[PDB]
């Protein structure tokens, strides 16, 4: 039968959610799946594991590269052995990989924007909390958000860069609160941010007056949603990433690579045809939170808080 290899990034619960998508797809298509994650971030553990899958003679590989560049030659090698590659979670656009599957950050960002727009009624002042001003994921989530509220009176008054630091994030949010007494909303870009913002809003005795829209579905964030402090967060879909990474790789064995591409979404990059699947985002909210929990339970994903 078939053997497909899937390589994550580290042990994190996120990557267990990928693991389960992987496994669900194997059952439903009747294929064997081998999922691997080193204990912690380590390209060499990945790159060697890639080598193992190749040696072992698997039928399909899906990787989420910790180093988008270092993987390239190894991936090239697998393709020459007739092993199909695809990428999930984080892309290596120049690696030879047939398909990328993961969150579309611009598109997500946009989603959060429309959500914000609706919550504020087209009018308001917003502060953004992010952890980087160079990273693509951060820029795209912000580009999307910006574009979504453009045609409204809504106004972004600041963009606080805590440089990957929650301590700072908290301080930064407080500063904005003190600088802007009439602030209407926070928008948080990385997973750190919604809760940092929520901590500050709650401490300020400003729940509901100051709205919060942000990213991801960590137990701290779900807690804040339950408490009615965060009105909406963009939950990503790691499960669907591994799932479709398997399916897509399965089809490439069954109906060929060419026929599989033809089914998939088509993007051009500087005249070059590419294929990319956006796993999208769940818009989780105080009112639909119970539903989201069940959905997750059913997928066999546990949820702490």
Q: Give me the CATH code for the 104-235+281-305 domain, please.
A: 3.40.50.2300
CA distances from 145 to 19, 117, 152, 168, 214 (A): 30, 10, 12, 23, 11
Best CA proximity match to 2, nearest among 63, 58, 81: 58
Sheet holding 32-36, edge to edge: 32-36, 3-7, 60-63, 85-88, 99-102, 272-278, 266-269
- Rounded CA gap, 58 and 4, in Å? 6
Same fold across 1-103+236-280 and 104-235+281-305? yes
Cross-strand pairs, 128: 159, 187
CATH class of 1-103+236-280: alpha beta
Spell out the alpha helix ranges (H) of the chain: 14-29, 43-56, 72-80, 105-120, 136-149, 166-179, 193-203, 219-226, 238-254, 257-261, 289-298
Q: What's the token pair of residue 113?
A: 């924007």
DSSP per-residue string spanning 199-217 = HHHHHTT-BTTBEEEEE--
Q: Which residues pair with 277 in a beta bridge?
A: 101
How far is the first Cα of the chain from the last one, in angstroms, to the nearest whole number? 40
Task: Please name the residues in contact with 287: beta carbons below 8 A apart, sequence gap of 6 or more.
Answer: none
What is the residue extent of each domain of the chain? 1-103+236-280, 104-235+281-305
Are the CB atoms for 231 and 210 separated by under 8 Å?
A: no
| Distance, CA of 299 to CA of 29 (rounded, Å) | 17
């Amino acid at each position: 039968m078939l053997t497909i290899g899937v390589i994550g990034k580290s042990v994190h619960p996120y990557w267990s959610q990928v693991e389960q998508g992987v496994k669900a797809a194997g059952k439903a298509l009747g294929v064997d799946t081998k999922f691997f994650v080193p204990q912690k971030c380590d390209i060499n553990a990945q790159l060697q594991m890639l080598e193992s899958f190749i040696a072992e003679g698997v039928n399909g590989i899906a990787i989420a590269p910790s180093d988008p560049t270092a993987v390239i030659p190894t991936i090239k090698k697998a393709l020459e052995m007739g092993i199909p590659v695809v990428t999930l979670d984080t892309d290596s656009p120049d690696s030879g990989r047939y398909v990328y599957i993961g969150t579309d950050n611009y598109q997500a960002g946009y989603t959060a924007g429309l959500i914000m727009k609706e919550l504020l009624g087209g009018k308001g002042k917003v502060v953004i909390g992010t952890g980087s001003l160079t990273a693509m994921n951060s820029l795209q989530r912000i580009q999307g958000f910006k574009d979504a509220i453009k045609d409204s009176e809504i106004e972004i008054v600041d963009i606080l860069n805590d440089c990957e630091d929650g301590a700072r994030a908290v301080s930064l949010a407080e500063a904005a609160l003190n600088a802007h007494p009439d602030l209407d909303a926070f928008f948080g870009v990385y997973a750190y941010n919604g809760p940092a913002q929520a901590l500050v809003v709650k401490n300020a005795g400003k729940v509901g007056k100051v709205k919060i829209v942000c990213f991801d579905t960590t137990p701290d964030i779900l807690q804040y949603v339950k408490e009615g402090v965060i009105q909406a967060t963009m939950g990503q879909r790691p499960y669907m990433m591994g799932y479709l990474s398997v399916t897509v790789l399965y089809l490439m064995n069954k109906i060929g690579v060419q026929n599989t591409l033809m089914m998939l979404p088509k993007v051009k990059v500087d005249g070059k045809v590419d294929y990319v699947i956006d796993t999208g985002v769940d818009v989780v909210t105080p009112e639909n939170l119970d539903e989201y929990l069940k959905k997750m339970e059913e997928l066999g994903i546990p949820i702490k808080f």
